[PDB]
Write a protein that binds this ligand. Sequence first.
Ligand SMILES: CCCCOP(=O)(O)OC[C@H]1O[C@@H](n2cnc3c(N)ncnc32)[C@H](O)[C@@H]1O
Ligand SMILES: CCCCOP(=O)(O)OC[C@H]1O[C@@H](n2cnc3c(N)ncnc32)[C@H](O)[C@@H]1O
Ligand SMILES: CCCCOP(=O)(O)OC[C@H]1O[C@@H](n2cnc3c(N)ncnc32)[C@H](O)[C@@H]1O
Lengths: 511, 658, 653
Amino acid sequence: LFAPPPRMQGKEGRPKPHIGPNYESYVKEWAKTVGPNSDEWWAAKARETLDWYDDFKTVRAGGFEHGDVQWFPEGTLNAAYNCLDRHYYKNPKKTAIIYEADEPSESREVSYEELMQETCRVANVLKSYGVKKGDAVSIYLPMTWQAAAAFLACARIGAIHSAVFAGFSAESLRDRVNDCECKVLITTDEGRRGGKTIATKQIVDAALQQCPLVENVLVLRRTGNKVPMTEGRDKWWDEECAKMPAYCPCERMASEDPLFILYTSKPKGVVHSTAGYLLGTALTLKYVFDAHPDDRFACMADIGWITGHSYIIYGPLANGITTAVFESTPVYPTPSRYWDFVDKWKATQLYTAPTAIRLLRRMGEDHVKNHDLSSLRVLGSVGEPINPEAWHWYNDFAGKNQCAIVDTYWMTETGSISIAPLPGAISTKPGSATFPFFGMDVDIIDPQTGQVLEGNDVEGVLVARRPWPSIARTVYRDHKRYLETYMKPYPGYFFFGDGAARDYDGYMWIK
Amino acid sequence: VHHVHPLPDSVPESEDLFAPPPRMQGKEGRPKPHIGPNYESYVKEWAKTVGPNSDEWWAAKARETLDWYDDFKTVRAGGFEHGDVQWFPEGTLNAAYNCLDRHYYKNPKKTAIIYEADEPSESREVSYEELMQETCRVANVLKSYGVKKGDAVSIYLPMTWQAAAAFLACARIGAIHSAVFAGFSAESLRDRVNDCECKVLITTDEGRRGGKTIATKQIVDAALQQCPLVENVLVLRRTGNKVPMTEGRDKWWDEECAKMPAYCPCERMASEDPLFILYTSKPKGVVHSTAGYLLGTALTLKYVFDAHPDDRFACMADIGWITGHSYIIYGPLANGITTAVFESTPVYPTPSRYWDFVDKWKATQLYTAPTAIRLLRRMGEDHVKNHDLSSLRVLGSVGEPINPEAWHWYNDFAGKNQCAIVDTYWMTETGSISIAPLPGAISTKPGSATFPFFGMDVDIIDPQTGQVLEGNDVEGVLVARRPWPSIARTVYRDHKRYLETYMKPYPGYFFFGDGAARDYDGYMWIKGRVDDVINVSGHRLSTAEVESALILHKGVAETAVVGCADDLTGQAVYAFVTMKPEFDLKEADLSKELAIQVRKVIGPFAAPKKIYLVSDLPKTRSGKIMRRVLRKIVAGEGDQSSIADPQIVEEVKQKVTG
Amino acid sequence: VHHVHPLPDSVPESEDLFAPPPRMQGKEGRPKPHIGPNYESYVKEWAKTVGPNSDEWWAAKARETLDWYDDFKTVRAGGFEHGDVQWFPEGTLNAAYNCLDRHYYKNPKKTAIIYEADEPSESREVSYEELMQETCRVANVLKSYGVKKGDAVSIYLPMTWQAAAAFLACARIGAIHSAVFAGFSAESLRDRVNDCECKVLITTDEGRRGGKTIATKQIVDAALQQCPLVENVLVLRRTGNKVPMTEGRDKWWDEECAKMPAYCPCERMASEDPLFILYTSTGKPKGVVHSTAGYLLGTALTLKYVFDAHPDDRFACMADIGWITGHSYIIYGPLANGITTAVFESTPVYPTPSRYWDFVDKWKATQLYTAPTAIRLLRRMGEDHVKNHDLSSLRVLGSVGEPINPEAWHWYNDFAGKNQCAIVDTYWMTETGSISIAPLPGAISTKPGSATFPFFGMDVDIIDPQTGQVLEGNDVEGVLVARRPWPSIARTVYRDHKRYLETYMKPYPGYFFFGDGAARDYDGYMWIKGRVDDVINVSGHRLSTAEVESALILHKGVAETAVVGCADDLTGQAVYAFVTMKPEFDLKATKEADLSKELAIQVRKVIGPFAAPKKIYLVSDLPKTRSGKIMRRVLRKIVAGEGQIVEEVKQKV
Ligand SMILES: CCCCOP(=O)(O)OC[C@H]1O[C@@H](n2cnc3c(N)ncnc32)[C@H](O)[C@@H]1O
Ligand SMILES: CCCCOP(=O)(O)OC[C@H]1O[C@@H](n2cnc3c(N)ncnc32)[C@H](O)[C@@H]1O
Ligand SMILES: CCCCOP(=O)(O)OC[C@H]1O[C@@H](n2cnc3c(N)ncnc32)[C@H](O)[C@@H]1O
């Protein structure tokens, strides 16, 4: 066990946590977010967290059975306005993105103003190509800060972006491009990671040879090395944006308009809508990571995955804080890079996968023991169970046993963290996600019985009892596959696909 | 000394007045009427809805009745002269939101549609949840075809419940639906599909009505060979019989919808955005806009039929005509009540069908047409006399004048003398009911529409004089003084025809095209189309008044009178007469009895010069008597395909020319 | 004593200050000024509109002046450096609603347009009802061609009242209109049509201007042979004479409109959606883009305050909708205010040079707005055309387009105004959207040739082009800059934002650069001296075109002049003058040599000895654009040797 450490109780001049100090304080608030009286909390949270063009009237409707989940349906908003414009109007020079380049010397801070201006220019480029509200746009970009401008330009005009991880092959890119039927692709000339050159345009050129709908390719000049360019079809990002004004109006989006598709391994195009997803990411960032206005949030994932979607771009920028976009690897130049980064920028949270937490602990304690790491308050794990040898090391060499460790469990289809400790309220057990997040009423069902095994010291499949705002709404042009995979196996429930157990202490353990 | 006479009736005028019966007085546990309990309560509310200070009532009614995304500022503007009528123009709303979403959110399992299939066993209740989900899937299918706000979508569907989902899916996204009655020939379909220039058509494999199979998909294919703009066809699998499916163009409804999410956002529509095009009988595309039309249907449904939240409204018309647009789909669903989609005919499997339907579902109101009333009246009382039917409180009649004889049969046997009868006058171009009794307030006369609805200020003009005839006991052509919210806004891409037809004949007025009389008590009588008058020796006759006289004779089921030129009287009346099957047939003596009764009740100038006793009248598939055919046959123009049974035409030619 | 001099004038400076006359004082039954009665009343209101606390006033004026569908939250944002200017960004509205619907709802029979046809008898009044219905019909026609929000639509229409309907039909549905002056060549039309990539073009069969025919449809057909994207052409039947019509592509306005309803909904536009592109004529055609709310607010406010417009005024701007002046002060400005605006189809000299004054007395115009070129044309025609007219309905007379010489200014004040009108010399540009510097007629005492003081929201300064630094205080001369964005500034150059930044934002970083020379005199009055590019540096003495031309016109029988610089080895540059004499002048009686001597002598007395021209050319007319601006770049290169009025000038040179 490990109760909330000094940095998560207001001591040493730190911000006091939003939920604290004990489990009773967490349960008091979470109880407001589930059950038949939880609309009130969700309605206020919706109106306090997001800027709306038109208010909503209904909080929620629909359910798992037919896949017609609705949240704040009559409201209209825009994700770019909430992640850029509204913070730009309040503090234009605040840093939105810490761009940590592959080479450390090339890093620099990108203000909300600069990010909004680039987003507006790209939005104007997409409009000049004929991209309309509801069209899909594919994005094949590595971890340069302009990836955020690419996402938010699509959201700004109501286009649906579909991000394709920049390590995917020509065939995997082709499949995802063809499935979403985008007519525009946004990519780079080359990607730079761990000191090597990704030939992204070369992969794009070979992929597009079997992509008959793509008519326009916008190419970011990331390296300037000679890459092939197809006349008419291919245009340079900087040359196109130079022609455009640095402001663009926001399309007024219905709450349930699709915000993006994310193909997850045939590739299944997981579709998230606008307000519910945006709310879930902003509330999870705030409470699960205890974000405060001046925080510098360092999520080391990739924007090609949902972790990059929710916890690099949408979550942090919606909260108006600073977010890191890390271009390199955990061990380039040396295995100390994560900590070189943490002290150089004074990151207040770090968020990473157990895979990397174990490629660092394997590289030796010499790379972490002589750093400050004092700016960190919360350390986060995501993607896979953290072995108890990894949990203790991340607490020791990364937190100096003074940061809370949040084991966050979720999936692409949940949009936002489902079960995790709130670091100022929950005492952690290594390898446990502990209690479920606001809006997540989870239970355990016996697969041999189809019956929920109530109580403690139980084990079975993990399910959810009621829809939550950030839940994925469909699988793109394959709603049947959406109902069969998540909704058919346990009627009245959502089926995560993961086994789980709840021990005597009520703590959840994800198998 | 009254110059205006009621439609011929066998009941004395002094005993032919019908006050709201106990079921419409808040007795017997029935809901109390919204407007009651006498005429002055009608006038009291009506007076707030016309004239220089009616904006306040209409602004308030609009905001109470409909859920708006954005409020309106202006209540009304525009006018007849240039056809620029506007209502609530700055407001935005969506018709599918008002007909589905807002009721789904309140009571998702409440029944939206009683789907009464052709085969009675296959009937079932469709919840607001289920109808909304199917509406959103179809809307999502339409968007995947590139249907945008303001695009036309043709609909060629019979009376299954999915037809409501087709209408509402178009409105959900701001597309303009153009519904085509599923009984129309390939040529009529083609003409409508081309005129509206839609790129998408929604239809069935087949339809089932009265136990026969309608080969809609086959008809579609013949039409589409002459509709170059149609790219997508969405085919509902209603029967499952093998039908042709053109690769690429044609997709199955259930297969497309299975790919799509069960919710879809609503397009935020301006008040004056076109909601639909409805062709009449070149085909004239009557355009209605959104807020004023929807408000019109919701208010008339509520007040003309005294609808209350648990009512099960049984309008037996077809969504292919305005009666089904306004009083099956939009009016009843906007009010959040339960509405019937009746897939069958009134006499299938037997003429007991309406009454089986009423008691099975405890229908609270019934709304049908005089041809159906006369059709069941013909088949006798065995099929109706032994039902309860006490769930009914209001019985409606629409489409033509209802002969008093038929009115009394409706009142005696459908209503067991315990329902109010609402004779509702209106047209496709008026959007909603223009003149009718409010059934908790108005004392009814058989054959009279009585008094104008909220927002309708109607007068009678002497057509020779062009001036309004002030007062009572007057006769002329019906006109409306000011625009009302649900009036048609244009004729599709033919605004000149719209102004020339309704707005030019009497400037400052809307011209209905009907002759009308207001009697001594102020009751309005719709007598017929202006174009259909018979002039005999200077006496102008409506067909309805002579036909009402003929049906007072025992054994008569239905008649159609026509005028024919005459050298000494200008025209003469000719009558085609239909008898109940039970009547014992001699023919020459019955015909003389019929002519004598017309001369006694109207005058010798109305007496048919000749009477043709036929076994059936020529009727279209939609049920109307084919009067032009009868006229042209009497006129010697026998050699000059809407006919439901063409063998009848030869039978009529034989009896006239043989 | 003063380093900055007024433009040379025959009147002594101490009698040359003109307080608001009684028509502008609320006497004789005239409306009381919105701002008055003196300089301090102007300053008191103007201080609310600039500086770090001016949001409150702009938010109030925006909500009071325009009808909004959605309110805004942010008043202003962005700046010159990147060209991301935003005003009222979250608000939504529609320009057609604001110029038509809301006035139609209140008083439908009020006259929106006084249509003054080429022939005076063919003129008539167009109600707000009639104009709204024609706008809605055309908007419905455009929607039937598939025009969507954000599409561009070219307009090649002469000055008939339907030009306003075509602009507003585009605004009504959110299309971006691109108007092209109806006299432009086919090659000029082609370039503008292709640049904006429109698929629809609105035009006439023919235009009528001064009894001459404008083969608009013939010119169009030539242009469209090289315009591949244009699919639909809507042809107004202005004359009904036989013009070619291409089957399918071309349709008749009246036949299309007759099929359409006479109401059409308004598209809900964001504040910063583009309203129109307007191409200007030193390089390629520059497509200046204005957005919706700020531009409309600016034209509405300037119309109200610079011309002191009141609800029943009959505003007579004599420009052409092909230029920004007609955009701002014929259509959008006056119709947003709900008043009556004039659409004048003729020329100032058709039928007689009394047309303007015939027009003014026929309609009882309350304000007149025209250009110095027209003023100096009527001047040379003689005063009998104006002398025996009433003209008393007038309260404000305005001048736009170029520096107005004091000689022209007094002729305007004495004859057009009978010394009872305020003269408002209005300085601005296509790129400013609306009037930038002008007298407020109920408050400001005018000097002949001074624009006087900045408008609400305009915070201007003078920079020394030789140092890049602002000149502090009064009695200074340099180049005019603005310190902050204003609501109606142009947002970009269409698909060429880099040219927008390089031209306006980069010359003096931190400021907006107008490209004009200017001086702020000892009283704080601003004087616009000419274009920076037209300045002539004679041995260090920087001479502006306006002051030398204003000197030359003080000579008897001089009608109009242009001076340009060319390099001379001794003085670096020397002044070269092209002079136009009134047509009655006897060129044989006066040897041109003695004319030159008296002219060069007259220049030395008002400006200085360095300012005399090195050579004077007598010409019959000067090279001018279709707008009327003198094409001094042509004269400068022709004088520099580098080669129909141009062939006459080159031969004479
Ligand atoms: C988490 C988003 C990254 C990619 O998301 P994805 O590719 O959709 O995969 C989701 C799967 O990650 C596993 N997982 C996630 N967090 C935990 C945790 N804290 N403890 C144990 N397992 C975890 C689950 O098995 C889940 O199903
Ligand atoms: C009304 C909806 C279906 C028909 O709509 P439509 O096809 O546009 O027919 C309009 C014409 O039907 C006649 N009509 C209609 N209802 C009545 C009535 N209650 N009493 C007398 N005549 C009536 C009129 O002549 C009218 O003008
Ligand atoms: C203003 C609309 C018509 C021309 O619009 P434009 O074609 O954008 O011309 C812009 C240039 O016109 C000159 N100019 C304009 N008005 C004045 C004035 N009152 N005094 C002195 N000069 C003036 C300037 O040099 C300006 O830069």
